[PDB]
Design a protein around this ligand. Structure first.
Ligand SMILES: Nc1nc2c(ncn2[C@@H]2O[C@H](COP(=O)(O)OP(=O)(O)OP(O)(O)=S)[C@@H](O)[C@H]2O)c(=O)[nH]1
Ligand SMILES: [Mg+2]
Lengths: 179, 139
């Protein structure tokens, strides 16, 4: 009955849409369609507070850079994501997403979210990354990045397994209720 | 529903000095309504940046969507915070407002602009999304 608006941003393919749908529909979306513009809604109760959360889904592809700012007005909390199986997605956090969000939305609380947590200890994933001299993002690296960009909090989740999904939105709601 | 008779009525009733810059750079005016083709018209509400609503007539043409405010017995092109209220159907996408069953989003994808429109009911909101979408798609 309290209304709040959440906007999710982050690199192409890092799991933003699957995270929203898993949360609001409790179903993992099977077919990947890259996002241009969508929006969803879910109710959540937190700390005895009942909140209707508007979920504004945005395009990770830079081809839609012009379009993303239409989603930022009136935002109460931002989920800024990277994928734990993609150290390059983490490095776009200070190089692209934070400067964009600080330009349009400078005083809006950010939850830094590492997605795809299921892949951290997945052997296939580690094996492929190692061929590239890469490793899955470690939780300390995510926490360090959260401090560097001044995020409200830091969470990790897997939409695929549902691990951590409820806690991400609990925290985002607490942040949305702040100020 | 007599579409051409309705369009003539809307033309005759809009104010000859009313104009609206489209996001392309093209200026739309009364005379530009003259030889358009009407798909549907009806009363709807636009949502301001401040969050408040204003009643308008939505006039969907085969190629454009137009919002008109009534002013002293005549139509004028609706004002909405510097946003263009004459909208090309090319590169336009339409979506439900998930948190408001009476609402729809129009996002013009030329810089782009988004406009939030509320029908008087969910059925009307659905009905409007349909016909806007059919017309975009030429069906
Ligand atoms: N293993 C695993 N895969 C996931 C997880 N979440 C999403 N994916 C997969 O990653 C791919 C992209 O996910 P998606 O949520 O659509 O990304 P997006 O960030 O929304 O992408 P875009 O719209 O900006 S291009 C899909 O193949 C999807 O199933 C996860 O938690 N674990
Ligand atoms: Mg997506």
């Amino acid at each position: 009955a309290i209304r709040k608006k959440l906007v999710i941003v982050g690199d192409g393919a890092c799991g933003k849409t699957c995270l929203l749908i898993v949360f609001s529909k409790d179903q993992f979306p099977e077919v990947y369609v890259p996002t241009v513009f969508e929006n969803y809604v879910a109710d959540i109760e937190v700390d005895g507070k009942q909140v209707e959360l508007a979920l504004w889904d945005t395009a990770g592809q830079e081809d839609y850079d012009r379009l993303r700012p239409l989603s930022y007005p009136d935002t109460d909390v931002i989920l800024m994501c990277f994928s734990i199986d993609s150290p390059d997605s983490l490095e776009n956090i200070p190089e692209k997403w934070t400067p964009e969000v600080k330009h349009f939305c400078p005083n809006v609380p950010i939850i830094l979210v590492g997605n795809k947590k299921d892949l951290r200890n997945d052997e296939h994933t580690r094996r492929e990354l190692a061929k590239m001299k890469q490793e899955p993002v470690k939780p300390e690296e995510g926490r360090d990045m959260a401090n560097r960009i001044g995020a409200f909090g830091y969470m990790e989740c897997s939409a695929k397994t549902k691990d951590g999904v409820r806690e991400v939105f609990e925290m985002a709601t607490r942040a949305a209720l702040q100020a | 529903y007599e579409k051409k008779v309705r369009l003539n009525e809307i033309y005759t009733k809009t104010d000859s000095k009313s104009i609206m810059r489209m996001k392309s750079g093209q200026m739309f005016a009364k005379e530009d309504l003259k030889r358009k083709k009407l798909v549907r018209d009806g009363s709807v509400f636009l949502k301001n940046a401040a969050g408040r609503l204003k009643e308008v007539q939505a006039v969907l043409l085969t190629d454009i969507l137009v919002f008109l405010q009534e002013k002293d017995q005549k139509y004028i092109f609706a004002s909405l915070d510097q946003k263009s209220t004459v909208i090309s159907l090319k590169k336009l996408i339409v979506r439900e407002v998930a948190h408001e069953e009476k609402g729809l989003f129009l996002i013009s994808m030329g810089d782009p602009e988004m406009v939030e429109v509320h029908a008087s009911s969910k059925e009307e909101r659905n009905s409007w999304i349909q016909i806007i979408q059919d017309t975009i798609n030429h069906h």
